[PDB]
């Protein structure tokens, strides 16, 4: 409906995952790193277009205001149910339809986040509604809706 305060915080965490040197901006290099580590393989050419399309001022990098404007649009995405499924498949590395703690540790490590085994088990607990000890599709959708 509106951009609530916690959502802004979530968006801030997303931003910081891109903004690897923590200098307030996302470069093509930083964007390239992240996408590579999430198994995407774009080209320098494609990356440059990706920056440009949401660089609505035109200085070659992305700051949080610009990021937020995009994230705001993405909040009313028609292709949203499908975008979430796609992200699920990135996390669910064995395609068995549940995200284990090991799987979550792998992605988080790939994003360059250094977590303790308790910090990981805490994130799983956050989403694990049925108490089985891992996040299934429905729980993932629930959390992100």
């Amino acid at each position: 409906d509106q951009l609530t305060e916690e959502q802004i915080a979530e968006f801030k965490e997303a931003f910081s995952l891109f903004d690897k040197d923590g200098d307030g901006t996302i470069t093509t290099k930083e964007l390239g790193t992240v996408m590579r580590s999430l198994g995407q393989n774009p080209t320098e050419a494609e990356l440059q277009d990706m920056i440009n399309e949401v660089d609505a001022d035109g200085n070659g990098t992305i700051d949080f205001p610009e990021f937020l404007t995009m994230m705001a649009r993405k909040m009313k995405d028609t292709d949203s149910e499908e975008e979430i499924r796609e992200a699920f498949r990135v996390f669910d590395k064995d395609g068995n339809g549940y995200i284990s703690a090991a799987e979550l540790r792998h992605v988080m490590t790939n994003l360059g986040e250094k977590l303790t085994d308790e910090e990981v088990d805490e994130m799983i607990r956050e989403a694990d509604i049925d108490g089985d000890g891992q996040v299934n599709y429905e729980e993932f959708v629930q959390m992100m809706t």
């Binding site: 968006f11 965490e13 999430l38 995407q40 979430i84």
Partner: peptide, 22 residues
Amino acid sequence: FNARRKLKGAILTTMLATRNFS
């Protein structure tokens, strides 16, 4: 430690990466 913010931020980052930063 905000486990939910950390997780949802990471999954949002994954959603961005799979749709060419959009």
